[PDB]
Structures are given as C-alpha cells and as structure tokens.
C-alpha cells in the first residue's frame, strides 16, 4: 500500500498470535513494543531517544506480520510511548519513501 | 526521489539558505530542529520520546525546503544530535510511505 501521513501512520500487527496496533516510524531504527511475553531466549539491552537510555528485552528471530507483510526479525519489549515499528522490519517488508 | 530505510533516511534540506542534513520521520509529529537562532518570538513546548521529554522552543511558519520541495510549518528547536522532519512538513511535499 501507500500510506499517507495527514494522520500517524498507525496499522494493525500480528505477533505472538495477538493483534496489536503499531506506528510506522523511520525514525526508528529498531522496533520497539510494548510489555508483552514472546516465545525463546532474550537478553537485556538499552535503547535512548533523546535525554537518556531505558531498559527493554531483546528477541531476536520473531515472526511478525506488518499490514499483511511477514517479517522475521528483532524485536525489542519495553516502555515505549507507543510500539514502534523501526528500519530493521520497515527494510523488510519493502518499506521506502517518497515524493 | 525515492528514500531507501536501509540506512536513515537522512536528506539535505534548506533553512535560510543553509544547508542542514536532516532525518524523514513519519514517527515525529511535528519538526526538531538542532539549535539555531531563528528570530521572533516562540512558545514552550515539551515533547516526548523514550527517555522522556525535553523543552523545545516552537516557532509557527517556518520555511524548510526538503530536496528542492518548499514546506512552511512549525518547528521545535531543541539540544537534539539531528534534525528531524516530521510529519506536519512531510505531508506539505507529498511524502508517502510505500511497500
Ligand atoms: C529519531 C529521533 C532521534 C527523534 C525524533 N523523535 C521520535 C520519532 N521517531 C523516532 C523518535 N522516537 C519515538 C517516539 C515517539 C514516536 C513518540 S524515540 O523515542 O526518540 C526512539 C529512539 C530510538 C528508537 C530505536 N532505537 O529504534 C526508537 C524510537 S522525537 O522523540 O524527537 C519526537 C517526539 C515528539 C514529536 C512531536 N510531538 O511532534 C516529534 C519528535
Ligand atoms: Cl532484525
Ligand atoms: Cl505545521
């Protein structure tokens, strides 16, 4: 799809069998969501925006799909403002922008 | 022209004629710019991001042209390490997010 930006480009995800609502952001370079539980191994890593660093968990290899297209990547668990999809799933799924 | 995600999407824009790199962020609502004396009065605003939030001064109807594109808005100018073109200017130059 296109997807303009006279609203916050929000859309529907699928992970961990649950539907949740994410924010496309090409600022991001990772992805970013919020507390939940994910299958297999994760480890702690720190993440900043822009007046200092906060803890999220990191898993890495998770299916997840974006408005209809499957990604397989890192996903990181945390307080975030609002989950996030980042560079690391946008390159995925084909994202690019344009004018 | 067509941004890639690979890397951030990090352009040149125009501000008073000078030339600034800046980030194409369909997550950030309004524009943050890094500090710069832009004349005539502004507002205090706060905004947030993962960390927290941080005190930016707004300035109304500033024009910022984006690879040869004119856009005229508000924009935030605070301590951040890049600028960044949110949505309220995107918007003006016909960005759209594609896959
Ligand atoms: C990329 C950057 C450095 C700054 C741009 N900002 C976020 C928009 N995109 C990215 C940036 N952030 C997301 C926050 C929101 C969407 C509310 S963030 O917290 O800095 C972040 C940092 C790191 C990652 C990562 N590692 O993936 C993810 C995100 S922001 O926090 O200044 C910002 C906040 C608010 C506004 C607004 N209200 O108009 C506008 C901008
Ligand atoms: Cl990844
Ligand atoms: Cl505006």
Redesign the interface.
């Known amino acids: 799809?296109?997807?303009?930006?006279?609203q916050?480009?929000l859309v529907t995800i699928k992970i961990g069998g649950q539907l949740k609502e994410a924010?496309?952001?090409?600022?991001?370079?990772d992805t970013?969501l919020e507390e939940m539980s994910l299958p297999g191994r994760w480890k702690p890593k720190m993440?900043?925006?822009?007046?200092?660093?906060?803890k999220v968990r990191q898993y890495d290899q998770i299916l997840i799909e974006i408005?209809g297209?499957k990604a397989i990547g890192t996903v990181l668990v945390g307080?975030?403002?609002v989950n996030?999809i980042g560079?690391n799933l946008?390159?995925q799924?084909?994202?690019?922008?344009?004018?």
């Open positions: 799809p296109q997807i303009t930006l006279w916050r480009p924010l496309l952001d090409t600022g991001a370079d970013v993440i900043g925006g822009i007046g200092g660093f906060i408005c297209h307080p975030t403002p996030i560079r946008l390159t799924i084909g994202c690019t922008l344009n004018f």
